[PDB]
Amino acid sequence: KNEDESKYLDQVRYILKNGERIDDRTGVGTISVFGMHSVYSLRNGVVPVLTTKRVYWKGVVEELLWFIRGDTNAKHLSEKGVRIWDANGSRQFLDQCGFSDRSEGDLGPIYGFQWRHCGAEYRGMDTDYTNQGIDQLSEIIDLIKNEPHSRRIILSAWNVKDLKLMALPPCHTLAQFAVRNGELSCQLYQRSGDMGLGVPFNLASYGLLTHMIAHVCGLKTGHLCHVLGDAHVYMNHVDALQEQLKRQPRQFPTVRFIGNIKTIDDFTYESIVLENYQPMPAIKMAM
Numbered sequence: 095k096n097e098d099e100s101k102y103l104d105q106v107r108y109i110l111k112n113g114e115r116i117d118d119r120t121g122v123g124t125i126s127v128f129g130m131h132s133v134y135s136l137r138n139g140v141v142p143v144l145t146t147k148r149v150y151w152k153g154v155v156e157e158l159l160w161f162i163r164g165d166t167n168a169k170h171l172s173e174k175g176v177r178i179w180d181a182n183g184s185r186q187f188l189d190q191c192g193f194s195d196r197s198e199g200d201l202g203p204i205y206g207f208q209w210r211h212c213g214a215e216y217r218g219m220d221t222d223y224t225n226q227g228i229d230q231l232s233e234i235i236d237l238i239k240n241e242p243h244s245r246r247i248i249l250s251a252w253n254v255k256d257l258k259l260m261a262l263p264p265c266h267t268l269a270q271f272a273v274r275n276g277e278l279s280c281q282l283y284q285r286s287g288d289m290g291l292g293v294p295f296n297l298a299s300y301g302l303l304t305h306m307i308a309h310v311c312g313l314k315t316g317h318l319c320h321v322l323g324d325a326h327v328y329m330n331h332v333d334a335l336q337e338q339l340k341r342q343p344r345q346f347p348t349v350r351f352i353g354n355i356k357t358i359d360d361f362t363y364e365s366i367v368l369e370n371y372q373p374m375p376a377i378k379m380a381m
């Protein structure tokens with residue numbers, strides 16, 4: 095019945111069967127298909143959080159609220175128990191990336207900074223950037239509310255001028271939104287998707303974001319189109335994904351929001367309720 099999760103599993107099956115074995119920039123083996131497309135229903139509260147292997151929902155929500163704050167300090171995310179960007183903010187990692195003058199935790203002008211302060215001069219994570227640069231997220235909300243048919247509703251982190259300053263160049267590269275029949279849809283262009291760990295997390299993230307923007311705009315939700323450039327499996331995740339591919343998906347969970355949430359900046363962890371997410375056991379995929 096969950097046909098949409100079966101699409102993700104069929105993508106993994108297709109990559110394992112037909113993908114090219116290529117060593118990546120780090121020298122580790124991947125299995126790669128370039129150019130994949132899948133669509134997930136977001137209708138009636140549905141968020142595409144995989145049921146065949148637990149997704150780190152606490153991490154998804156805290157990472158997204160941290161993006162929305164325009165925050166680039168890994169320590170703020172780590173304080174909430176979410177360690178996913180800690181390696182990239184470490185003294186060692188910063189020094190090896192030629193960021194010796196940066197304080198530990200400073201990821202540079204990554205997603206959140208580009209979303210809220212696009213084009214502002216980065217001067218470290220501790221600087222107050224309020225009303226500096228272009229607030230793409232506020233601008234997209236203004237387009238959805240005032241000009242829902244716009245072909246120009248784009249949220250991008252691909253700031254070429256700032257790529258050299260970033261801990262990591264963005265993998266979830268841009269998202270386009272559209273309104274039809276009072277339903278908000280999202281097309282996510284992901285230049286690079288690790289099908290094991292990254293892609294399930296990223297699908298949950300943009301599904302949730304689309305629901306949050308729809309909530310703020312008083313709209314229903316439509317679909318999430320997921321466009322992949324390099325859709326890949328790490329060679330050391332193949333056995334884990336073969337275990338997952340034996341599992342039959344359950345119905346995706348739904349999200350509901352609590353309280354008076356007027357703007358995109360008014361969401362809290364407590365305001366976001368995930369309903370009926372009881373996934374099958376987590377499968378360890380290291381890195």
Ligand SMILES: CN(Cc1cnc2nc(N)nc(N)c2n1)c1ccc(C(=O)N[C@@H](CCC(=O)O)C(=O)O)cc1
Nearest residue numbers: 150153176177178179288291292293295378379380381
């Ligand atoms: C999006 N992201 C950041 C991130 C950073 N660098 C990367 N680098 C690579 N090569 N691949 C990735 N998927 C990746 N992901 C994530 C997302 C989820 C988890 C995750 O599931 N974290 C578990 C980690 C447990 C484990 O490693 O098995 C946790 O409990 O924190 C980690 C990183």
Ligand SMILES: O=c1ccn([C@H]2C[C@H](O)[C@@H](COP(=O)(O)O)O2)c(=O)[nH]1
Nearest residue numbers: 119263265286287288291292293296
């Ligand atoms: O949210 C994230 C973060 C990282 N990655 C994966 C994709 C690649 O395996 C790697 C990034 O390496 P490049 O594509 O930049 O080489 O991390 C994801 O899939 N999603």
